[PDB]
Design an enzyme around this catalytic site. Structure first.
Site, mmCIF file in Angstrom:
data_model
loop_
_atom_site.group_PDB
_atom_site.id
_atom_site.type_symbol
_atom_site.label_atom_id
_atom_site.label_comp_id
_atom_site.label_asym_id
_atom_site.label_seq_id
_atom_site.Cartn_x
_atom_site.Cartn_y
_atom_site.Cartn_z
ATOM 1 N N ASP A 140 95.018 27.166 -19.629
ATOM 2 C CA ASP A 140 96.158 26.409 -19.102
ATOM 3 C C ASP A 140 95.957 24.793 -18.622
ATOM 4 O O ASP A 140 94.737 24.774 -18.305
ATOM 5 C CB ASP A 140 97.334 27.231 -18.404
ATOM 6 C CG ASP A 140 98.517 26.675 -18.259
ATOM 7 O OD1 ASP A 140 98.999 25.904 -18.983
ATOM 8 O OD2 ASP A 140 99.380 27.176 -17.452
ATOM 9 N N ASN A 141 96.860 24.283 -18.491
ATOM 10 C CA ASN A 141 96.710 22.844 -18.015
ATOM 11 C C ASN A 141 95.689 21.892 -18.472
ATOM 12 O O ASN A 141 94.556 21.647 -17.865
ATOM 13 C CB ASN A 141 96.610 23.055 -16.395
ATOM 14 C CG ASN A 141 97.947 23.744 -15.942
ATOM 15 O OD1 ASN A 141 98.867 23.181 -16.172
ATOM 16 N ND2 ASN A 141 97.700 24.364 -14.969
ATOM 17 N N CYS A 150 104.605 19.167 -12.528
ATOM 18 C CA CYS A 150 104.048 19.956 -13.363
ATOM 19 C C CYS A 150 103.573 19.096 -14.242
ATOM 20 O O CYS A 150 104.216 18.660 -14.762
ATOM 21 C CB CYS A 150 105.176 21.064 -13.523
ATOM 22 S SG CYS A 150 104.358 22.499 -14.314
HETATM 23 N N1 MTV Z 1 98.666 31.204 -7.211
HETATM 24 C C1 MTV Z 1 99.276 30.526 -7.927
HETATM 25 N N2 MTV Z 1 99.850 30.871 -9.165
HETATM 26 C C2 MTV Z 1 100.432 30.050 -10.018
HETATM 27 O O1 MTV Z 1 101.196 30.588 -10.888
HETATM 28 C C3 MTV Z 1 100.475 28.751 -9.820
HETATM 29 N N3 MTV Z 1 101.136 27.551 -10.528
HETATM 30 C C4 MTV Z 1 101.054 26.551 -10.160
HETATM 31 C C5 MTV Z 1 101.510 25.566 -11.093
HETATM 32 S S1 MTV Z 1 101.161 25.218 -12.693
HETATM 33 MO MO1 MTV Z 1 102.218 23.289 -13.599
HETATM 34 O O2 MTV Z 1 100.900 21.950 -13.933
HETATM 35 O O3 MTV Z 1 101.762 24.564 -15.379
HETATM 36 S S2 MTV Z 1 103.329 23.250 -11.190
HETATM 37 C C6 MTV Z 1 102.587 24.539 -10.410
HETATM 38 C C7 MTV Z 1 102.751 24.813 -9.241
HETATM 39 C C8 MTV Z 1 104.100 24.619 -8.706
HETATM 40 O O4 MTV Z 1 104.222 24.971 -7.531
HETATM 41 P P1 MTV Z 1 105.681 25.168 -6.995
HETATM 42 O O5 MTV Z 1 106.169 26.315 -7.567
HETATM 43 O O6 MTV Z 1 105.742 25.348 -5.452
HETATM 44 O O7 MTV Z 1 106.641 23.862 -7.428
HETATM 45 O O8 MTV Z 1 101.640 25.735 -8.309
HETATM 46 C C9 MTV Z 1 100.444 25.853 -9.021
HETATM 47 N N4 MTV Z 1 99.904 26.973 -8.153
HETATM 48 C C10 MTV Z 1 99.926 28.188 -8.625
HETATM 49 N N5 MTV Z 1 99.238 29.099 -7.484
#
Ligand code: MTV
Ligand code: MTV
EC number: 1.7.1.3
Lengths: 453, 453
Positions: free
Chosen positions: A246-247, A114
């Protein structure tokens, strides 16, 4: 020959989750909640992450959900549909069953991390817009699925196309979570970007994108879109709200007030995070661990990960506030898979052997005399990659407090005949050297990490 | 539409070169000799490098010759032969005329930089095994030639092949200069690795590899082999002496004595340099420049470059010893070529437009009040790339003193109503803040860059 793991998937929905929109989601109690009971954002405890080894159990894998988990009935899964549209010759829609049947399947070890990992440390200095993460906002898995590259390849992207937008099925506050990745990364066998439907041999748990997600190695979790529904080949970056707001690692001098009151700090790709930076983290000794002084070695230990598949060349530990440095011995289990040639695992080709990239974390160890630690105020650790890019001494404080990769510091406290060790912070509780330093009134960004000499 | 330059190639061999093995080589007198009269290793003066702009004139381009320049008669050039052998299906030998006639030609702006740039700064701290370089061990050019990838492609590399060894025609002390690069980088349009036979519209000057050289963007000069003769596709890195015992960043704690007396510090690829690290350098104000205090802006200025084609996202300047930072405005002339679409230049296709990578340096500027500089002890500058990898505060001292990318510091000296500015060092003379600090007895690796508070 290399690490493999599959565990029993959990069944019991916890009381806390029963009360919530995610009432159908079985979650490991050892995970540490970071936005309360919901939405679920969690990390395992640092010792459990490390003790699990190269492969994190699915149930202890970290979760980052911006909103609620979309309900997915298993008796329909195979018909889960994904849309490939945009600047292509031949748009098409493919369902999971047909993904499985028509594209080459691979199984691949991938470290996820993350953007937010090590965020609390930033928050202790100056509270930003993001919720605390500890250091365990990472987990490593075997992922099984096809290559995003092959799916996208089949629609014949046009020559002017540069980006693949991804969009999920979930409904966070600001609508469908979506972002993007570069097209040529999709085409690059070394990057090895997947559309995965299994994780450590199991169909996806709901927190990890059930039934289907993108997994982008060497890149922040944020770009690995869960509950995948659309892929849009395009000449320019995503316009999703979540791509903009974000990010991103905004310039250090930009304040939360400036970013609230000026949209366009968020509209320059130069601050949008893709490839991770280099992180090294100390896991042994653990937080609050006590050890009796003696003439013995103690094995300092941890893990590290990097972005873009660039190997970490050296990990170095200082016990003298970075005046001198000791070379740690690094272990890279990804090379085990590399050395081993072609295998079938969970119905997918293990072909790390085709690549030179490091898509996964690694582990390091260094034995020092307890008596040398006895004369030290801290353990520091840093890594340097094969681009000779090293982690900084100095913190890069930023609004979202992302990618905080300044040297990780464990304080050494002398107590008569023992030593107690403090990590910077605990993810969801007090208990670190930073908590102490705030009580003392130290400036954590000064040259002595806010401590007294 | 974008920068283009070709100048008259020089004719006059200088008296110093007349006395030498390179008696046939016309060299610009403004270049600064770094290993005496021969072998020729030189850099331009920093102000001339900057003042020339995005494209360095050929004659002021930096030279790094390990030994003597091989004599190449122009009336035979086209028949200059190169050998493609090794783990290929179909080894072959191609001459330059046939390179030109049978492969697609491109013209491309590429920043070159020597591994050694900013080395003197390391030497001031602790003298290593390398000769002083200043900060101008870089020069940018348009290079015309084909893609190494296409040449190597034509022999059909085998599936197990990972590296392309390159070997030159010259005869340094330890024989033919040779090293390698990774095969997949050769195949990657974004990296854009060439076999070049022109530079800023002109056939190669002898110092730059006449008639033929490899040019590897985003990578240290050391891998851009001049006077090319062999290309050897292989499963493992080069075994040339110059691959092992030059162009490595050995771990900081490794001493010159340890490296002399243990061969195997040089036999771990993890310390072998390919992709450059991120550098930012201040050019305005210049070394020793005096300026009268007033209520006016002064435009601090410089350039920066990075490795692996990763763009520099931000350049930041501190006047308060890195407590706060100001965002500089960056200019990237490579984007001019990118924005402009397809062109023919010097008989080669300009197709930066096909790529997203930054293979070239960039320029930055920041206006501050002279009165703010008046209250400062120094200007500091750092950059951070699109991997959120930032230059370090701390110096990474190493045996060959390569890739020294710690923040570049210009000291501000108050003298009544003016300010004088000192750069760290001058390449081949005294004249910097480091010279002064050595006379004072300062520890340059302390937290105040060896200066007094
Ligand atoms: N559809 C979707 N919704 C999310 O809120 C979403 N968040 C993600 C982020 S934001 Mo970060 O760079 O704030 S880490 C991360 C993860 C983590 O996946 P995990 O929950 O399977 O570990 O999937 C990314 N993919 C997402 N995909
Ligand atoms: N054949 C050959 N001999 C060299 O001594 C040799 N040195 C190089 C180095 S080592 Mo360094 O990372 O120590 S910068 C650099 C350059 C510079 O080329 P230029 O002289 O045209 O600027 O070419 C590389 N290619 C070479 N090729």
């Amino acid at each position: 020959p290399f690490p493999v793991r599959q565990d029993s998937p959990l069944t019991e929905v916890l009381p806390t989750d029963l009360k919530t929109k995610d009432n159908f989601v079985a979650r490991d109690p050892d995970l540490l909640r970071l936005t309360g009971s919901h939405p679920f954002n969690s990390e395992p405890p640092l010792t459990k992450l490390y003790d699990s080894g190269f492969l994190t159990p699915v149930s202890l894998h970290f979760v980052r959900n911006h909103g609620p988990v979309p309900y997915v009935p298993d008796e329909n899964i195979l018909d889960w549909e994904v849309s490939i549209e945009g600047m292509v010759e031949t748009p098409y829609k493919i369902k999971l069953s047909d993904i499985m049947e028509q594209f080459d399947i691979y199984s691949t070890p991938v470290t996820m991390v993350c953007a937010g990992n090590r965020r609390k440390e930033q928050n202790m200095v100056k509270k930003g817009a993001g919720f605390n993460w500890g250091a365990a906002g990472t987990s490593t898995s075997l992922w099984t699925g096809c290559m995003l590259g092959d799916v996208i390849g089949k629609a014949r992207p046009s020559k002017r196309a540069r980006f693949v937008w991804m969009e999920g099925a979930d409904n966070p506050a600001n609508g469908a979570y979506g972002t993007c990745i570069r097209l040529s990364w999709c085409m690059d066998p070394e990057r090895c970007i997947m559309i995965a439907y299994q994780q450590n041999g199991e169909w996806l748990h709901p927190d990890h994108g059930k039934p289907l997600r993108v997994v982008i190695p060497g890149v922040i979790g944020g770009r690995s879109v869960k509950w995948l529904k659309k892929l849009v080949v395009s000449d320019r970056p995503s316009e999703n709200w979540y791509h903009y707001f974000d990010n991103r690692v905004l310039p250090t001098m930009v304040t939360p007030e400036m970013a609230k009151s000026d949209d366009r700090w968020w509209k320059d790709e130069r601050y949008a995070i893709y490839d991770l930076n280099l992180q090294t983290i100390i896991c042994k000794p653990e937080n609050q661990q006590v050890i009796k002084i003696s003439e013995d070695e103690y094995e300092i230990a941890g893990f590290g990960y990097n972005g873009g598949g660039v190997r970490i060349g050296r990990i170095e530990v200082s016990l003298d506030k970075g005046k001198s440095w000791k070379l740690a011995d690094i272990d890279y289990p990804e090379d085990r898979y590399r050395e081993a040639g072609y295998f079938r695992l969970f119905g997918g080709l293990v072909n790390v052997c085709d690549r030179m990239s490091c898509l996964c974390w690694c582990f390091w160890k260094l034995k020092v005399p307890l008596s040398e630690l006895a004369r030290s105020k801290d353990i520091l650790i840093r890594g340097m990659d094969e681009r000779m890019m090293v982690q900084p001494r100095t913190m890069y404080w930023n609004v979202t407090s992302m990618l905080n990769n300044w040297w990780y510091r464990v304080a050494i406290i002398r107590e008569g005949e023992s030593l107690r060790f403090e990590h910077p912070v605990v993810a969801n509780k007090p208990g670190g050297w930073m908590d102490r330093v705030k009580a003392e009134g130290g400036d954590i960004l000064d040259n002595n990490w806010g401590e007294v000499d």
